[PDB]
């Protein structure tokens, strides 16, 4: 009944999260750069479909997650999935100003977002977020904490204590990493706030991206996997 998650030390939490990390996947090995709605949306939905499978098995390895009922696990993943793909994308792209690293063999700039109708806006938001993370010098250890926070937080009010204690535990872990990195107390709480405010922006982008995927579903630009359709359908 008591969750192992709360009994973990900060270092144990960090190592558990680092070890749960999914791998960076590749897209198709074609030399052409996507300049059509169809090709680009095909590559992106294909990539999302594969990353989703990894995300599902990552989530089970986030301390405290498997202590939830299956229905609550379903709800959290349904609410958070696009936010999680997006933060992953933004993180990957950090060392590439102006570009989104969808995959090591698929690095896109805004001029290709200009192609797909209604996409460049989301593209630009993602780029701004990436730039923000770069300027804050976000660390990998901080990144994985933020990602788990998204997983546990996004659908938590729509339930809706265990999750709240786990969320507190992750906050303790972020502060721990910041102290360990040598920040003063003032820098610690200021940095914590800065990172969490960005989560609001990521939620905004997910909402916009969900709209976009919906119009894409209705325009039938490209077939979507049943998994991707169900994750979309969850947001009704």
């Amino acid at each position: 009944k008591n969750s192992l998650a709360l009994s973990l030390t900060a270092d144990q939490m960090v190592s558990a999260l680092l070890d749960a990390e999914p791998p960076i996947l590749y897209s198709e090995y074609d030399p052409t750069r996507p300049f059509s709605e169809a090709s680009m949306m095909g590559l992106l939905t294909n990539l999302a479909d594969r990353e989703l499978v990894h995300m599902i098995n990552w989530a089970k390895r986030v301390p405290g997650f498997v202590d939830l009922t299956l229905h609550d696990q379903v709800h959290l993943l349904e609410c958070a999935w696009l936010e999680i793909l997006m933060i992953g994308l933004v993180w990957r792209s950090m060392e590439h100003p102006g570009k989104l690293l969808f995959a090591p063999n698929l690095l896109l700039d805004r001029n290709q977002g200009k192609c797909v109708e209604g996409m460049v806006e989301i593209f630009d938001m993602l780029l701004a977020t990436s730039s923000r993370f770069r300027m804050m010098n976000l660390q990998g250890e901080e990144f994985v904490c933020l990602k788990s926070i998204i997983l546990l937080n996004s659908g938590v009010y729509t339930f809706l204590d265990h999750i709240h204690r786990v969320l507190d535990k992750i906050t303790d872990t972020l502060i721990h990493l910041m102290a360990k990195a040598g920040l003063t107390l003032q820098q610690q709480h200021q940095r914590l706030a800065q990172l969490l405010l960005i989560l609001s922006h990521i939620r905004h982008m997910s909402n916009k991206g969900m709209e976009h995927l919906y119009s894409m579903k209705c325009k039938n630009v490209v077939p979507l996997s049943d998994l991707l359709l169900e994750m979309l359908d969850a947001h009704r």
Binding site: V53, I56, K60, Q73, L77, L227, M231
Partner: peptide, 9 residues
Amino acid sequence: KILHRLLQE
């Protein structure tokens, strides 16, 4: 749901 199944795998 497919998600239901994959969470169980």
